[PDB]
């Protein structure tokens, strides 16, 4: 079965084709089995240089989560991650504020809540609010990629109208939606 841990299910995919947008990365995910799996328990990755998909840059980027890699991917020019699972959120209003190079998309309960559909050097976007109607574990997924060069990915979330933001980590993540005791 699907292991229960305090994190999202992570998949890494590399390619020697150019990633320009969300569609390109999603097509890469659809095209093959993941080059590596991991547990995404502390979703604040990077920053680094000289291509995420080369050498040990992925390990450096994933940091605290890299010890759960299923393998050490070989070199590629371009690469990214697909995260999916659950996040505990009380009913209320929230918004993401994301620092990234290159682009990304986060969905909650199937609906996009933070999107950058293009390549970019590091930039921080404060995204529009969204609502949670019922307290509990919410479905969440994320994609992020690097087309080359520098790389960073730090989604943060606010519950208090943008006064404070937190990283999504083992305090509130669940791989399956069951309560983790890990
Ligand atoms: C679009 C930008 O291109 C630059 O050359 C890269 O160094 C940045 O990391 C980013 O991907
Ligand atoms: Ca796949
Ligand atoms: Ca490697
Ligand atoms: Ca780190
Ligand atoms: Ca670790
Ligand atoms: Ca959708
Ligand atoms: Ca590229
Ligand atoms: Ca880049």
Author numbering: 10 to 191
From the primary publication:
MpPA14 (Marinomonas primoryensis PA14 domain) lectin is a domain of a 1.5-MDa adhesin responsible for a symbiotic bacterium-diatom interaction in Antarctica. Bioinformatic analyses indicated the presence of an ∼20-kDa domain near the C terminus of MpIBP that is a member of the PA14 family, which is a carbohydrate-binding lectin module widely distributed across several kingdoms of life. PA14 domains share a β-sandwich fold and the presence of two consecutive aspartate residues in a cis peptide linkage (DcisD).
MpPA14 lectin bound l-fucose most strongly, with a Kdapp of 0.65 mM, followed by N-acetylglucosamine (GlcNAc) (Kdapp = 1.07 mM). With Kd values of 147 μM and 170 μM for l-fucose and GlcNAc, these two ligands had a greater than 2-fold higher affinity for MpPA14 than did glucose (Kd = 350 μM). However, the well-resolved 1-Å electron density map in this study unambiguously showed that fucose bound MpPA14 with its cis 3,4-diol in the gauche conformation with a dihedral angle of 47°. In contrast to the MpPA14 hexose ligands, which are all in the d-configuration, fucose is in the l-configuration, with hydroxyl groups of the fucopyranose ring pointed in opposite directions. This helps the endocyclic oxygen atom of fucose point toward L11 and hydrogen bond with the sidechain of Gln156. The l-fucose–MpPA14 interaction is distinct from that shown by the bacterial C-type lectin, LecB, from Pseudomonas aeruginosa, which uses two side-by-side Ca2+ ions to directly coordinate the 2,3,4-triol of l-fucose. The additional ionic interaction between LecB and l-fucose can explain its enhanced affinity (Kd = 58 μM) for the sugar compared to that of MpPA14 (Kd = 147 μM). The addition of 0.5 mM l-fucose was extremely effective at blocking accumulation of lectin on the diatom, as the free sugar outcompeted the cell surface glycans for the binding MpPA14 and displaced 95% of the fluorescent signal.
